[PDB]
Each structure stands twice: as C-alpha cells, then as structure tokens.
Ligand binder design. Structure first.
Ligand SMILES: [Ca+2]
Ligand SMILES: [Zn+2]
Length: 197
C-alpha cells in the first residue's frame, strides 16, 4: 500500500552565504537531491512530494547552533509554531552549511512521522558531491519513519547502503532490505495518518 510524504526543505542563512546568494543555484542543488531520494523512496512504496522549499535569505528564523541536538530541537519547535500554518506538509528537513560539533553531519527524531514539532531532521551540506548529501537527507528522513542503522548482512545489492552508520564514496543510493522491513513495519504498526493522503 502506497504512502505519500509531503516534505518541505528549509535552507538556512549560512547556506545562502555559502552559495553567494544565488537562489537559483540553491534550488538546483536541492532539486537534484529530491530527484535522487524520490527514486530511493519509491522502492519502499513511499511517494515523496516536494510541498515547498524555504530559503532564509534575510536571516535565520532560529539560532542554528554547533550543537546538532540544540538546532534539531529549535527547528522542530519553529516548524510547529510557524511553518505548519503556512504550508501543509508531513515532514521538514533543515539544510545547513554549519559544521556541527564532532562527527555529526545529520540528526533526526526517531519514529516521529506527523508529530508537529518532531517530524524533522537536520542535515549538513557536507559534500560537493550532490549524491552524498542526498543520501544523508534520505537517512534522517528514514530515522523519522522509524528505521535504524544497517548492520551485519543487511544489503541493497552491496552492503553499504543509505542507513549505513558511515557516509562514504561507496555508499549505494538505495535502502537495504533491513531498512525496507523496518520502515514498512513502522508504517504497518503506527500507521501515521498524515502520510495516508
Ligand atoms: Ca500528508
Ligand atoms: Zn543515522
């Protein structure tokens, strides 16, 4: 049974600076990522719809911190207080050029699909290869859908897939059988209504 996920991508001010204010360049970068993950999600029978793309060109609407956990929390709260009343969507992801403390390049709440303040994730625009960033984006969204990291013999043809605990050159842009299983059982068990439409 097909599920539909209406998402909004939010681009922060550090990203706008990183791209020298070129809003079109920013749109092309984000669009290519969406193109990539739309395919990956189709194989889990989840249709991705880009409901909106918000760019914080004037200034950030939250304080994006080096602390990934602080930023994630602030982002969800801002989403619930502001964003959901302007655009109807099921999930929102923040794209930032900020380098978070430690090895962290993305963070997200687990099993929180449809929660006003928790159906969110944060991702660092960590690579010049669009594919690597798209994978991180897919990864955090997957955490919202209750999927955990791959391990052992989980595979997607090869063994290094989207839910790999490490992002690299050899990561395959597809979800493993493990991710498929976990994702579908979460939907089956929790059946979040917002992705039913
Ligand atoms: Ca929806
Ligand atoms: Zn993860």
């Amino acid at each position: 049974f097909q599920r539909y996920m209406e998402i909004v991508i939010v681009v922060d001010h550090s990203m706008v600076k990183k791209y020298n204010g070129d809003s079109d360049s920013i749109k092309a970068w984000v669009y290519e990522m969406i193109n990539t993950i739309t395919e990956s999600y189709s194989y889990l029978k989840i249709d991705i719809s880009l409901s909106g793309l918000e760019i914080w060109s004037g200034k950030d609407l939250i304080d994006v911190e080096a602390s990934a956990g602080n930023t994630l929390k602030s982002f969800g709260e801002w989403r619930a207080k502001d964003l959901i009343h302007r655009i109807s969507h099921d999930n929102a992801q923040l794209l930032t050029a900020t380098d978070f403390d430690g090895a962290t390049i993305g963070l997200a709440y687990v099993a929180s699909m449809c929660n006003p303040k928790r159906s969110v994730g944060v991702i660092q625009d960590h690579s010049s290869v669009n594919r690597l960033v798209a994978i991180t984006l897919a990864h955090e969204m997957a955490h919202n859908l209750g999927v955990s990291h791959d391990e052992g013999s989980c595979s997607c043809g090869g063994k290094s897939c989207i839910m790999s605990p490490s992002i690299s050159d050899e990561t395959i842009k597809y979800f493993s059988d493990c991710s498929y299983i976990q994702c579908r059982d979460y939907i089956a068990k929790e059946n979040p209504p917002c992705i039913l439409n």
